[PDB]
Amino acid sequence: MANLDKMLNTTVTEVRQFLQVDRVCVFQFEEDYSGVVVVEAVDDRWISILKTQVRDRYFMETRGEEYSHGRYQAIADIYTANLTECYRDLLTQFQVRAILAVPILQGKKLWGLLVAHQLAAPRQWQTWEIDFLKQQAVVVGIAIQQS
Ligand SMILES: *C(=C)[C@@H]1/C(=C/C2=NC(=C\c3[nH]c(/C=C4\NC(=O)C(C=C)=C4C)c(C)c3CCC(=O)O)/C(CCC(=O)O)=C2C)NC(=O)[C@@H]1C
Numbered sequence: 001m002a003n004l005d006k007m008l009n010t011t012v013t014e015v016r017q018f019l020q021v022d023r024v025c026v027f028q029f030e031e032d033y034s035g036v037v038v039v040e041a042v043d044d045r046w047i048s049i050l051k052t053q054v055r056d057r058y059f060m061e062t063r064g065e066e067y068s069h070g071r072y073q074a075i076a077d078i079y080t081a082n083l084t085e086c087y088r089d090l091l092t093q094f095q096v097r098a099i100l101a102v103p104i105l106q107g108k109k110l111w112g113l114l115v116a117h118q119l120a121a122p123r124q125w126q127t128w129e130i131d132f133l134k135q136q137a138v139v140v141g142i143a144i145q146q147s
Contacts, residue, residue: 004147022119064110
């Protein structure tokens, strides 16, 4: 079968349950580095962002180049982090307190992001959790090719 959608759904569920976080989702980039939240596991208590189309200026202007070379975002508390206003308001609209966002690659090509959000309260991200989510993104990268 190699059903990609099923594997991705299982992945984000697996991650959300194991890290005990409020949302894990996959953001898939369009050809211009806009994109869509294509798969999501979220706690019922918060609003689902599934299939939201996002036109993020940082991604669209850089064309993901930094994320293609392994940059990631790990922020425990988005209100004390130094974020520009419009990006903080996107996160606020997604009800985010803390964010761990890692690149999903096809070779060196940035295909999307694998993102964990904490929505209840801030949350320190541990070293291993960053490695965990990155390694999950590796597994997704393999699956995408062969889907
Ligand atoms: C203003 C014009 C807005 C805008 C600008 C910026 N976005 C920025 C960085 C950025 N954007 C993302 C995107 C997501 N985070 C998610 O959780 C999801 C979906 C589930 C998406 C699509 C991330 C991860 C980052 C961090 C990049 C990084 O620095 O590692 C920035 C730069 C950050 C800053 O200076 O605060 C700007 C500016 N994005 C908007 O949507 C509107 C258009």
